[PDB]
Amino acid sequence: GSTLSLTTGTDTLTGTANNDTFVAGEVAGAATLTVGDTLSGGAGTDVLNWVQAAAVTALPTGVTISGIETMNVTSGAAITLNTSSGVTGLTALNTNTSGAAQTVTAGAGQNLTATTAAQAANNVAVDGGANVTVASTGVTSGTTTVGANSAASGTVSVSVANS
Amino acid sequence: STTTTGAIAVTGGTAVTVAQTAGNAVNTTLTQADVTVTGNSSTTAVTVTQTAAATAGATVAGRVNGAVTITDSAAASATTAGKIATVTLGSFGAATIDSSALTTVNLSGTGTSLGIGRGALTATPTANTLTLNVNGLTTTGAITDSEAAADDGFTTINIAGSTASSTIASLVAADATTLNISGDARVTITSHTAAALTGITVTNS
Ligand SMILES: [Ca+2]
Ligand SMILES: [Ca+2]
Ligand SMILES: [Ca+2]
Ligand SMILES: [Ca+2]
Ligand SMILES: [Ca+2]
Ligand SMILES: [Ca+2]
């Protein structure tokens, strides 16, 4: 497939209907998933990689992801996002912190995986989704909490390590 | 694609045909293209075919239909004739026709709504027979005679069902007088709104 790069602007990107991958990194340490960004996939080998130094805070205004099967979200700080709207066609959501909180809500039909290193006193909270997986290491005070607001369609699989 | 078919617009010609298809995969929905045809004063006929709508299933390719808008030249004129006589549809979303010369509409496949207006001719029309040939037609909503309400609609509607069953969710024809259902295969009208009707006459097999 083809490989498509988001900019610090408003992007209108449309995949090949093939193995295509969407990169939503940083530019000068400025985020590239930004207000009004609209992304479109085609055929079923579609990946969106969202990587940011800054905390993920929500999906930004007017952002719509469509036809993209896997969403990877990695932050140098906390993640808070909801993907029960704007996003359609998403089978797999993977969110990644190291040393800060997570507060994620997925749409049913989407398999959530919330991996967190060095959780410490930070709290993981996840909701909705199809199969959910929480993978937390270096844990300490942190609560882990699943489906407090909305249950999973499929299986829950928490695991938590403390030193 | 699953991304939707972008406009189609035509202006002018002796006869116009726009034939869309949809070939998307078995668990996806493609919504089809909005069509506009605007006749010039040579345009006798217009045809606008699409792929039939369906609900995205496990093994059912999903399709939504595009709006169609057909307009004759002399649609806004008080005096000029009008040339579009026949319109053929094969599936449709929110369809419109506007022609004072319109006599025949051919319907087919999966429809949302048809609104028929006649040109804003001020002259009182003498020939007021809508022939409406149906064949495998199914409608979400209404076939309306938009002209009948505040102006001079069709007095007699003829519906000829053909080779396959048809179902019109609603038929609204406020100036209609006679209604003759004819032909070859079942015509079902789930709900008519035709207050001035003096007779209905089925001749259909
Ligand atoms: Ca952007
Ligand atoms: Ca693709
Ligand atoms: Ca895709
Ligand atoms: Ca009128
Ligand atoms: Ca008039
Ligand atoms: Ca009237």
From Swiss-Prot, chain B:
State the compartments where it is located. Answer: Secreted, Cell wall, S-layer
Q: Could you tell me the superkingdom of the organism this chain comes from? A: Bacteria
The misc remark on file is:
The calcium binding of this protein may mediate surface attachment by ionic bridging between the S-layer and a specific membrane-associated oligosaccharide.
**Described purpose of this protein according to its UniProt entry:** The S-layer is a paracrystalline mono-layered assembly of proteins which coats the surface of bacteria. Probably acts as a physical barrier to parasites and lytic enzymes.
This one is known as S-layer protein
User: What species is given as this protein's source?
Assistant: Caulobacter vibrioides (strain ATCC 19089 / CIP 103742 / CB 15)
Q: What is the lineage of its organism?
A: Bacteria, Pseudomonadati, Pseudomonadota, Alphaproteobacteria, Caulobacterales
State the encoding gene.
Answer: rsaA
Whole-protein residues included? 412 to 616 of 1026
